[PDB]
């Protein structure tokens, strides 16, 4: 209806007038993101300007997926799209796409370094799991969970940003980092990387090449079982099979009482227990989302409304699948980018 410009680095953000006080909160390959005041909601929001949405066919497919994925989901633990607009008034001059989302205070990078009692820890992890489960029910496996795309508010609420997906390696599941396939509990690995790191205040599995990432896995978790190592392509296996053979450090050693709110013992053994089940190299031995939510450490928080909530749509397995011209991707995206 009416737009104005604000620079923002080398980029120009032309936005609806209701969005004011734009300042950069993050950037990368997806696009540049500002926090902004929304005059019409009297609330702060995040504006993302998509990075060259129509440079080529993968850029365009990625922008339409952002949008069709968003409008498969509606949950208190998932960042929702509030608005999308374009300053261009006709299909043929259309180029720029802005996504407007909920804003939070901070990512989990802050929080991992502080020192939480059990209810906050347990309550953050519970909200992470309700968000993850809602993604999975919609046909979305995230694969790229980590502290930086999990965002929080000073009222202790929490949302998961994109999905996944979309350097980032530390939190990626062994089935991923060894090119096996994956299913739903691939996100369970990552929750254990976050949780384990929340308790220990350092990255569970550092390095700097996958090579070194595998080292820290086995150094701490021991070498996996021989059967697991058959499932691996002859090439990954040869490598993996011929590394040093660790027994693993065990979970009491990795995460001793000294590291927790204490009795409170109980209690630490509940947290230790969940981690012993989440951080399991073999996805076939790893806890699922459901059992992690039914787990005594998380299950205190159980609400049917937050857990069993079905998604507005299950995501079209495929189309995923399906190509269009850049003229025909434009049409589909413009359609959304003024979709009322």
């Amino acid at each position: 209806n009416q737009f104005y410009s604000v620079e923002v680095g080398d980029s120009t953000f032309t936005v609806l007038k209701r969005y004011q006080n734009l300042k950069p909160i993050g950037s990368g390959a997806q696009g540049i993101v500002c926090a902004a005041y929304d005059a019409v909601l009297d609330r702060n929001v995040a504006i993302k300007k998509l990075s060259r949405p129509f440079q080529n066919q993968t850029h365009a497919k990625r922008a339409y997926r952002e949008l069709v994925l968003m409008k498969c989901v509606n949950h208190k633990n998932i960042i929702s799209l509030l608005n999308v607009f374009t300053p261009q008034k006709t299909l043929e001059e259309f180029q720029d796409v802005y996504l407007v989302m909920e804003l939070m205070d901070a990512n989990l990078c802050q929080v991992i370094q502080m020192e939480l009692d059990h209810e906050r820890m347990s309550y953050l992890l519970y909200q992470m799991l309700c968000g993850i489960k809602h993604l999975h029910s919609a046909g979305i496996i995230h694969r790229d969970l980590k502290p930086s795309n999990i965002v929080v508010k000073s009222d202790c609420t929490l949302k998961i940003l994109d999905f996944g997906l979309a350097v980032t390696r530390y939190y990626r599941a062994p089935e991923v980092i060894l090119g096996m396939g994956y299913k739903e509990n691939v996100d369970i690995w990552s929750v254990g990387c976050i949780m384990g790191e929340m308790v220990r205040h350092k990255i569970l599995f550092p390095g700097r090449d996958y090579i070194d990432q595998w080292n820290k896995v086995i150094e701490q978790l021991g070498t996996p079982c021989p059967e697991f190592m058959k499932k691996l392509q002859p090439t990954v296996r040869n490598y993996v099979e011929n590394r040093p053979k660790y027994a693993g450090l065990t979970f009491p050693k990795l995460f001793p009482d000294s590291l927790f709110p204490a009795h409170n013992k109980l209690k630490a053994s509940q947290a230790r227990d969940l981690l012993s089940k989440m951080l399991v190299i073999d996805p076939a031995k790893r806890i699922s989302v459901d059992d992690a939510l039914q787990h005594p450490y998380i299950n205190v928080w159980y609400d049917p409304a937050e857990v069993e909530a079905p998604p507005p749509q299950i995501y079209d397995k495929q189309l995923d699948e399906r190509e269009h011209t850049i003229e025909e991707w434009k049409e589909l995206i413009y359609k959304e980018v003024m979709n009322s």
Binding site: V111, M114, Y123, V152, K153, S154, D155, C156, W301
Partner: peptide, 10 residues
């Protein structure tokens, strides 16, 4: 069943 209401982001 009473959740935290605060998180020290300060």
């Amino acid at each position: 069943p009473k959740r935290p209401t605060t998180l020290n982001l300060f």
